[PDB]
């Protein structure tokens with residue numbers, strides 16, 4: 076359970092002389108904060124087993140910056156064994172608190188994928204032209220998980236695959252779709268707005284796709300900025316299931 | 325005389341349009357320059373011919 | 377057409393005729409849509425919103 | 438050139454001879470618990486259909502696939518219209 | 519038939535967890551309806567919420583996982599709770615097997631615009647309670663495609 080950090084020059088491959096900290100406690104999750112140190116090293120945060128947070132390089136400037144920006148940092152830990160999701164805040168004094176918590180019962184559903192959208196992507200067109208000389212706004216939530224769980228019932232006729240669009244900050248489940256009579260393995264891609272998860276259909280014995288597109292109203296709610304705490308309008312979901320005539324890897 | 329005058333009148337614009345068509349075929353698929361003012365979206369099909 | 381002072385008024389009539397064409401131009405716009413009046417033509421002007429709440433993590437390590 | 442696959446339980450399975458040199462058409466095979474088993478053409482749409490194909494799968498190839506796309510190479514006759 | 523679920527709230531100056539009983543949820547599994555029976559806020563709770571609102575704190579809700587086997591919880595900006603005239607909606611998400619999955623609380627309208635709120639406003643719990651069962655996703659449409667292609671062929 077003990078985790079270690081190895082710092083190296085990615086060009087030459089040699090370990091950097093900066094001794095990485097010794098992660099004494101087992102860790103659960105890690106974050107690559109976009110904040111950078113003076114030497115343009117992106118701050119990295121680790122959450123240990125005692126739910127404490129260890130920064131790196133964790134200098135005074137780094138400590139100050141992330142202590143001053145603490146309440147805007149949220150972790151989410153997905154315990155697949157218990158079917159639990161937890162979301163923790165970041166206190167000023169480098170401590171975490173139980174912000175939100177959900178439990179998907181492992182007795183009927185086991186979490187199999189927690190695919191979130193890539194952090195290093197951009198969206199060019201915030202909205203899309205719907206014709207009519209009108210625009211339909213995409214539901215660009217940057218803190219949107221796409222937790223996909225399988226049915227613990229392995230029967231070919233009663234199996235199902237659930238997909239929950241749980242938020243990453245407030246813990247709100249935007250969508251809780253459950254496709255019946257389907258079985259894994261499921262290969263899901265999460266992008267700017269849409270998600271696409273391939274699966275097996277036991278009833279008809281055929282690999283099937285299912286594209287979920289998230290759209291807002293004809294007019295954007297909060298423009299200037301997006302906050303997961305300021306989205307009282309549940310985004311509309313567009314779904315479509317396609318047939319894939321082959322397997323997938 | 326009518327054919328000659330019609331051809332002379334035609335040769336003032338038609339060569340230009342034919343050169344434009346030939347260029348469009350020859351240089352299809354590029355992005356040459358960015359116009360420094362925000363043109364309307366409705367002008368897209370003709371400004372960006374050959375771009376997907 | 378400046379035979380008398382009415383030319384000035386005549387000029388206005390000429391302008392009115394031009395105005396008529398301008399009116400048709402508006403109709404032409406309504407018939408072509410080649411005018412940046414709708415929100416769609418403003419789509420390219422929308423900068424992406426900044427993220428306000430940061431959330432990371434995932435499956436238990 | 439023949440092939441044999443062992444350890445197959447009852448059900449429906451799509452058999453495909455994967456080969457980068459020459460493609461092969463997939464064929465569905467329905468084997469029952471009792472032992473009788475049959476072959477047919479796969480169809481993910483309207484799966485209820487049956488187009489029988491002999492069981493000793495004679496999956497003759499259809500030549501090398503077409504991974505590549507030829508150059509356009511438009512001529513002046515294309516420029517004409 | 520009907521199951522009662524506890525529902526606690528918490529809001530403090532230090533934004534810690536001090537969940538206290540607020541309302542009972544009567545989830546009738548047969549007809550799939552949920553009804554809450556909460557007590558109105560008191561002066562100290564209103565006062566406590568005022569400093570929490572003043573300090574831009576959070577308002578956290580918590581219910582037991584089962585009708586003490588666990589809890590599912592969420593939070594909402596209490597200042598956004600108070601700037602919305604205590605108008606919010608809590609959605610109860612369950613699974614296909616009829617097990618509690620999560621609780622989501624959101625105000626109406628969301629966010630904040632610095633609107634000062636008097637105490638008298640906070641003597642009512644404008645709370646819209648909904649239950650969200652997992653929505654079955656639609657499968658691929660084949661009948662339309664086969665019939666349409668049949669018409670095309672003929």
Ligand SMILES: *[C@@H]1O[C@H](CO)[C@@H](O[C@@H]2O[C@H](CO)[C@@H](O)[C@H](O)[C@H]2NC(C)=O)[C@H](O)[C@H]1NC(C)=O
Pocket residue numbers: 605606626627644645646
């Ligand atoms: C609780 O507050 C919400 C938000 O103010 C109320 O919802 C409004 O209802 C009116 C009609 O009564 C609509 O015109 C508004 O658009 C609604 N606002 C929304 C949805 O944000 C709601 O009626 C209040 N009461 C209850 C019991 O839910």
Ligand SMILES: *[C@@H]1O[C@H](CO)[C@@H](O)[C@H](O)[C@H]1NC(C)=O
Pocket residue numbers: 296297298299300302305629630631
């Ligand atoms: C978005 O919400 C904030 C409050 O969270 C508000 O101040 C702002 O005016 C809203 N709209 C935009 C476009 O930022």
